[PDB]
């Protein structure tokens, strides 16, 4: 895809915003966040529009807008394509107030380019409106993200939601009977016991001088791979600073494997992000202001975004990985 390099650089830009905030587990979906905002940009104009796409790491002089949206159209279609060994689904939903005077071109554009579903919602019946949005997300994430929306203004005019769902099996899974409690060094002086999966086997593992890290590629059955970066002592900040899309592509091209004894923890991570302020530091601000130009959505009255909430959940265990994300714009 002509937009995959931009999506990777957006992943790293957003990651670096989140890592600059004390230290916490980070987990998010770059594709979910970017797809929701690119879809929203179809309804925006002028500076409001240019800021969104530039905040997704597109240069509009180098890649015209029509090529950006066709990029997402093909990306989404490919992520959803039939596949027997890997579960992977993604969808967009547009929830519109009854009697919102909708600009038809916006509806036609989001259906064609972002494959969006569209629903008429009475946000005045808040329990039923929340139930529908939460139903869309719960069914999309196969039960992994439940009750995404807890409070929803009864005067809401529209909401835009993206979800993504992933469930893969390891090409070479771990054996549950070999998982044991081992120390995790949360810092140089403190440890906690965690369940550590263990296998002696043939792994795709390399040491990177640019990253000062060991790099492990764990393949899933089907068309996905997880990449793990283990920084050298004192080099976690260096690792975070040096990640680039070109460096990642180089690792994916190496197919070599070597014997190693791998210890990898089971993981269960959940987090909810208010992305308004960090997206602001990536340059996306006018759309959240009273000067927002969303006149491609409706021309009846001025409209702006007030919320940009992302939730993502991750399970890693001996069989594989299950992950889901949702992006909610209102």
């Amino acid at each position, epitope marked *: 895809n002509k937009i995959t390099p931009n999506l990777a650089e957006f992943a790293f830009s957003l990651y670096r915003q989140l890592a600059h905030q004390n230290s916490t587990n980070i987990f998010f979906s770059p594709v979910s966040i970017a797809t929701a905002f690119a879809m929203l940009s179809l309804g925006t104009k002028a500076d409001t529009h240019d800021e969104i796409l530039e905040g997704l790491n597109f240069n509009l002089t180098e890649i015209p807008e029509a090529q950006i949206h066709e990029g997402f159209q093909e990306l*989404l*279609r490919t992520l*959803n*394509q*039939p596949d*027997s060994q890997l*579960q992977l*689904t*993604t*969808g967009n939903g*547009l929830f*519109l107030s*009854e009697g919102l005077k*909708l600009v*038809d071109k916006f*509806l*036609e554009d989001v259906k064609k380019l972002y*494959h969006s*579903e*569209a*629903f*008429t919602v*009475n946000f005045g019946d808040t329990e*039923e409106a929340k*139930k*529908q949005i939460n*139903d*869309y997300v719960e*069914k*999309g994430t*196969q039960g992994k993200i439940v009750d995404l929306v807890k409070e929803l203004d009864r005067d809401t005019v529209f909401a835009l939601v993206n979800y993504i*769902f992933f469930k893969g099996k390891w090409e070479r899974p771990f054996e549950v009977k070999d998982t044991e409690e081992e120390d995790f060094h949360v810092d140089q002086v403190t440890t906690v016991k965690v369940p550590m999966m263990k296998r002696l086997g043939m792994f795709n593992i390399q040491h990177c001088k640019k990253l000062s890290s060991w790099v492990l590629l764990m393949k899933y059955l089907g068309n996905a791979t997880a990449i793990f970066f283990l920084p050298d002592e004192g080099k976690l900040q260096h690792l975070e600073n040096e990640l680039t899309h070109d460096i990642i592509t180089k690792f994916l091209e190496n197919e070599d494997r070597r014997s190693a004894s791998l210890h990898l923890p089971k993981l269960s991570i959940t987090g909810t992000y208010d992305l308004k302020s960090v997206l602001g530091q990536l340059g996306i601000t006018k759309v959240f202001s009273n000067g927002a130009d969303l006149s491609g959505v409706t021309e009846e009255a001025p409209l702006k975004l007030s919320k940009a909430v992302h939730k993502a959940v991750l399970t890693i265990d001996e069989k594989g990985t299950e992950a889901a994300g949702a992006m909610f714009l209102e």
Partner: antibody
Amino acid sequence: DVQLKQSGSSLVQPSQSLSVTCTVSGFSLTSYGVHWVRQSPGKGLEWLGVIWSGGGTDYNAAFISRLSITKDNSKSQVFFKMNSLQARDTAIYYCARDFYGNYGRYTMNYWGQGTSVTVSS
Amino acid sequence: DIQVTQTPSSLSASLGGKVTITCKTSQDINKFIAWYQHKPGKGPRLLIHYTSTLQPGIPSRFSGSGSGRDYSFSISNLEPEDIATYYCLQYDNLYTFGGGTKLEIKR
């Protein structure tokens, strides 16, 4: 990116059985039900049955002894089978998907392209 | 097992006029009725669900009302692109289509 795609149009001999496959993408069959509907020449739409996300089924009462709907979640396929076809079963057969219809009820949307079936020797 | 009586089964309407179709059910369906447009060689197109809720992009020409066992559907300002067959669907207790209304142009 919600899609329902049906197998090709068939010629069925009288008293023999009809099989149609609906292959879906852009959603999981563990999340939504898939319906089957026919339209005979000069007649209206007629609902035939549904296979729910959990695997349970419901059928039009006039067809209970004739119909079977099964599925394979992992292949995203739904399978429609009807036995003992006669001339009056010539029709276009459609699959369609649950669509949020408020308060926990679902109507039909996202129709397959239809499978024309002619019953004739 | 819920029976649905849709009337009339055929209707000649004038361009720019108004048409009204009714659906009566054999028991209370609690406003779970939807309305579809069907043109030859096309999939049925959802116009309205829960009695009166239009889908995004459906023209204001279309409207629905009712409750209990008695529902109605109307097309105002009839246009040539509206010439089609129309169906109600109860979805309160399984699913039952009305018999359809084939709309034709008066001349």
